[PDB]
Design a protein around this ligand. Structure first.
Ligand code: ADP
Ligand code: A5W
Ligand code: MG
Ligand code: MG
Length: 265
């Protein structure tokens, strides 16, 4: 169906490990979108064809305002191209670099939007497993959208692919290569809430080895300015034991969230 000829390409929107993403416009309709470019040689070398297929299958069938749309794909002997919804206000990651810290209203609103999208995902036993600021994008009204479903699976699951970069958002069961389910995304949710309010992730360290130790022991502390409500929610999500982490409805109905969010469930 679609091929490269059907699009005029524009400015680079960002870069990932495999992803090189560009603004583009379809020639006959003038529809504006984002083109995620992947190099076949690099995909084959790392052996992640299965992740690519998963990304397309899962993201094209999900429909939710807080989840980024994937419309289709094509390829041409050097490259694979994913056709995505364009997010005009950028990543949450860039916004955090701009402001250093978010206030409680901004943080609680993002958490609600995230929890709504994840509740929709989990109702199909889809778990994302790679929730972090560079994979959260912003729509034209500043609403959060989850993206990058390349690491997603159906629960329960083991891990067959090598962990690449940072350990900062991953739970103990995940880094220890044990068995895991939906509760992994709730741990990541707790890491995010902390990083939004403080400006850095709770287990951050100078080395891989020390970061691993701080995660498996759940060693974090709060600066003075973090309020009691925020501490309560965060302490509930960052539990070593998966089964002790709350349900998403409990997050959406937490008093600190309801007192500070500007959006509903
Ligand atoms: N639909 C989009 N709209 C705007 N920017 C995007 C979009 N998709 C990706 N980006 C930018 O490109 C980066 C990499 O995209 P991603 O799909 O996360 O690639 P990877 O799979 O390599 O992580 C993102 O962190 C973001 O900066
Ligand atoms: C249903 O197959 C796909 C769904 C989404 C994306 C890609 C595919 C196919 C399988 C992957 N591939 C390739 O050339 C591989 C990637 C290294 C060569 C393109 C065709
Ligand atoms: Mg990514
Ligand atoms: Mg990816």
């Amino acid at each position: 169906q679609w091929a490269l000829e059907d699009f005029e390409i524009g400015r680079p929107l960002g870069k990932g490990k495999f992803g090189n993403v560009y603004l583009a416009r379809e020639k006959q309709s003038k529809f504006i979108l984002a083109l995620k470019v992947l190099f076949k040689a690099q995909l084959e070398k790392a052996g992640v064809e299965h992740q690519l297929r998963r990304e397309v299958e899962i993201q094209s069938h999900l429909r939710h305002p807080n989840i980024l749309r994937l419309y289709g794909y094509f390829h041409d002997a050097t490259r694979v191209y994913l056709i995505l919804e364009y997010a005009p206000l950028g990543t949450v990651y860039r916004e955090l670099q701009k402001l250093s810290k978010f206030d409680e209203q901004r943080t609680a609103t993002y958490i609600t939007e995230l929890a709504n999208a994840l509740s929709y995902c989990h109702s199909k036993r889809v778990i994302h497993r790679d929730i972090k600021p560079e994979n959260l994008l912003l729509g034209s009204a500043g609403e959060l959208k989850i993206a990058d479903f390349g690491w997603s699976v159906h629960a329960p699951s083991s891990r067959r692919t090598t962990l690449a970069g940072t350990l900062d958002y991953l739970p103990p069961e995940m880094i220890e290569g044990r068995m895991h389910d939906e509760k992994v995304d709730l741990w990541s949710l707790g890491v995010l809430c902390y990083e939004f309010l403080v400006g850095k992730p709770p287990f951050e360290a100078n080395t891989y080895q020390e970061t691993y130790k701080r995660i498996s022991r759940v060693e974090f502390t709060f600066p003075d300015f973090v309020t009691e409500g925020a501490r309560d929610l965060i302490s509930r999500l960052l539990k070593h034991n998966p089964s002790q982490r709350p349900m998403l409805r409990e997050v959406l109905e937490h008093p600190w969230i309801t007192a500070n969010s500007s959006k509903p469930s």
